[PDB]
Design a protein around this ligand. Structure first.
Ligand SMILES: *[C@@H]1O[C@H](CO)[C@@H](O[C@@H]2O[C@H](CO)[C@@H](O[C@@H]3O[C@H](CO)[C@@H](O)[C@H](O[C@@H]4O[C@H](CO)[C@@H](O)[C@H](O)[C@@H]4O)[C@@H]3O)[C@H](O)[C@H]2NC(C)=O)[C@H](O)[C@H]1NC(C)=O
Lengths: 388, 145, 49
C-alpha cells in the first residue's frame, strides 16, 4: 500500500521538514506507507506555487501538505477547491470557509481578545505584521468599537530592514504622544525578536510596560533578554511541554543528530514545526480510517494536466476530505479535532506570563469556556486586613 | 488562471481585464513571469508589480488631504475588504502621526440575508462616542446600502 | 557590568554612569547609548589630533 502525497516546503523550513521526517518515522505502519514528494519553492511566489501544485497533481497525489503566504493562499484554496484536492497546512487559518483545506493552526483571535479583557485594557498599541493577514487586526478593531477601546494600530511590517532604526525611533515617538505603556506584538517569531531587541535598547522594557506576544509560540523566542527588565510580558503557548506526550517527544527530539535533522537538537520546538508533526499523524489516521471503512480511492499518476478544461474533479477526493476532517487524535498541540470546513475545534491554548524564574502558565483558553485561570499561586499575600 | 493561460496559448500581445483582492496575486505573478502586459481599471496593486498597467489612480492621497481640509480629528471609517486594506492602512498609519481617533469597522463581512440587526448594532457603537463624521470606503453598491 | 545594567533595565533616563578609566571609547557604548542614562568617562587618546 503506497500512498503518494505532496509536500510544499518553503525554502528555510528546516525544523518544519525535520519534524515532518520524524513524523513519517513515528507514524509508519506495515498496513501502508506514505510517499512524500518534496518541492522546495518560494511560498510567496504565487506562480511557483501554481506549478508545484499542478506538478504534484500530475504525479497523481491523494493529498498535499504545505504552506502558503498572504499572497499565495488564494491560489491554494482555489485550486484545491476546484480539483477536490485536500490540502493540509500548519499556516495561518483561512479567512472564511474554504473546502478541501485542513488547518493545523487554531484561531488565536479569540484567545487574544479574552486576554485583553482579563488585564482590563482600554488603551493599547497594536503593532501588527501583514504577513499572516489582517484577520486579527480587524478582530481587535471591530471589538474596539463594542468594548470601546482606543487602539493605536501600526503596521510594523513594511519597515525596510537595511536602515530600520530611524523608523523604530519614530515609532515609539508616536507611542509616546499618548504615553502608550501597553503594546501588543502581532508578528512572527523573527519580527518579534527584532522589536524586543529595540525595546531593550531604548529601555522601554522596564517596570510600567506590558507586552503581549500575539502568537502560538510564546516560548519559541528568546525571552531571557526582556525577562529581567521589569516590564510584564504575556503570550500564548500551544505546545504544552508539561504533557507526558510532548515531554516524551522532546526526549527523543533533543537527542536527534542536528546534522541529519537541521535545528532539531533543542529542548523546545516552534509551534509551526510541532503542527507539521501533528499533520503527519492526522494524514495517517485519515488514510487508515479509509482502509478500515472499505473505501477504494486508489488511482495512478495520470490525473492529467490541472489546467484541463473542462476541469473534472475526481470523486475519490470527496472521501479523502471526509476522512481527514473526521480524524481525532492526541498530538503535541493538544486535542486535535475538526469541523466540516477544516478549522480546528475543541482545542486548548495556554495563557502564559513571563516572571522572574521564567515563563509560567496562568491559565488556558477554550473555544467554549473562554479564559480559565489555574490557581498555581500563593494568593492572599499582604491582603490580611488589620482588625480594628 | 485558466482564462490567462487560454488567452496566452491563443498567442495574445496584451491582456485587458479585472482582478479581485483574491485573484490579483495570480495576475501580477503570471504577467510578471511570462512578460505579458496586463491593463486593468481595477484597484492599484499594493507594490511595484511589472507588466501591469493600472487605469485607476491612487485615491489614498486625495482622501488623506480631504480629511485635513475639514480638520477631522475623530471619525468613523467603514471599509470594505474588496479593494484591499491599502487605504485602511493609510488612514491608520496617518492616525498615528496626525493623531486621529479612527473607529475602523469592516462593513464587508455583513451577511446580506439578515443584514439589519447588524446595522442597528453598527450605529450603536458609533453612538458610544457620538460619531458624527463617517468615511464610507466601499463600492458603488455597498454605499447605496 | 554594562551588559547586566541593560538587562535589568537600569540604563534608562535617571541613571548616571562614570567609566573610571583612560579608555572611554575603547569599550562598546552603542548598547547603553540609546538607553537614556547619561554616561561619562575619560579619553587619553584624542582622535582629533
Ligand atoms: C472534546 O475535547 C476533550 C479534550 O480533549 C475530549 O476529552 C477526552 O475524552 C476522552 C474520551 O472520554 C478521554 O479519554 C479517556 O480518559 C480516561 C481517563 O484518563 C481513560 O480512562 C480512557 O481510557 C479509555 O479506556 C476505556 C477502557 O474501557 C476504553 O473503552 C476507551 O476506548 C479508552 O481507551 C480515555 O483515554 C480523554 O481523557 C479526554 N481528554 C481530556 C479531557 O484530557 C472530549 O472527548 C471531546 N469531546 C467530544 C464530544 O469529542
Amino acid at each position: 500500500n503506497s500512498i503518494q502525497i505532496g509536500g510544499l516546503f518553503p525554502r528555510g523550513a528546516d525544523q518544519e521538514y525535520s519534524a515532518f521526517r520524524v513524523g513519517m518515522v513515528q507514524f509508519s505502519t506495515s498496513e501502508f506507507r506514505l510517499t512524500p514528494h518534496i518541492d522546495n519553492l518560494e511560498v510567496a511566489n504565487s506562480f511557483a506555487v501554481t506549478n508545484a501544485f499542478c506538478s504534484q497533481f500530475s504525479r497523481g497525489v491523494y493529498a498535499i501538505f504545505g504552506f502558503y503566504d498572504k499572497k499565495s493562499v488564494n491560489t491554494i484554496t482555489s485550486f484545491c477547491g476546484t480539483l477536490h484536492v485536500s490540502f493540509i497546512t500548519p499556516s495561518f487559518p483561512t479567512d472564511g470557509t474554504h473546502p478541501f483545506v485542513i488547518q493545523m493552526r487554531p484561531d488565536l483571535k479569540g484567545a487574544l481578545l479574552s486576554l485583553i479583557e482579563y488585564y482590563q485594557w482600554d488603551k493599547f498599541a497594536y503593532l501588527y505584521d501583514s504577513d499572516r493577514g489582517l484577520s486579527t487586526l480587524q478582530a481587535v478593531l471591530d471589538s474596539a468599537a463594542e468594548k470601546k477601546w482606543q487602539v493605536t494600530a501600526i503596521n510594523v511590517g513594511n519597515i525596510n530592514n537595511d536602515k530600520k532604526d530611524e523608523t523604530y525611533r519614530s515609532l515609539f515617538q508616536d507611542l509616546e504622544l499618548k504615553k502608550e505603556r501597553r503594546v501588543i506584538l502581532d508578528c512572527e517569531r523573527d519580527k518579534v525578536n527584532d522589536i524586543v531587541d529595540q525595546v531593550i535598547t531604548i529601555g522601554k522594557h522596564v517596570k510600567g510596560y506590558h507586552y503581549i506576544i500575539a502568537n502560538l509560540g510564546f516560548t519559541d523566542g528568546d525571552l531571557l533578554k526582556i525577562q529581567f527588565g521589569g516590564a510584564e510580558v504575556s503570550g500564548f503557548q500551544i505546545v504544552d511541554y508539561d504533557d507526558s506526550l510532548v515531554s516524551k517527544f522532546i526526549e527523543r527530539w533533543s537527542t536527534l543528530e542536528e546534522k541529519e535533522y537541521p535545528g532539531a537538537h533543542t529542548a523546545t520546538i516552534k509551534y509551526t514545526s510541532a503542527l507539521t508533526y501533528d499533520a503527519v499523524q492526522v494524514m495517517t489516521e485519515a488514510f487508515r480510517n479509509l482502509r478500515k471503512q472499505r473505501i477504494e480511492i486508489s488511482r495512478r499518476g495520470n490525473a492529467g494536466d490541472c489546467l484541463a478544461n473542462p476541469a473534472v474533479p475526481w470523486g475519490q477526493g470527496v472521501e479523502i476530505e471526509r476522512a481527514l476532517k473526521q480524524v481525532q487524535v492526541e498530538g503535541l498541540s493538544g486535542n486535535i479535532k475538526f469541523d466540516q470546513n477544516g478549522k480546528r475545534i475543541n482545542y486548548t491554548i495556554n495563557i502564559m506570563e513571563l516572571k522572574t524564574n521564567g515563563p509560567r502558565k496562568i491559565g488556558y483558553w477554550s473555544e467554549v469556556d473562554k479564559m480559565v485561570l489555574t490557581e498555581d499561586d500563593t494568593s492572599g499575600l499582604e491582603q490580611k486586613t488589620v482588625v480594628v
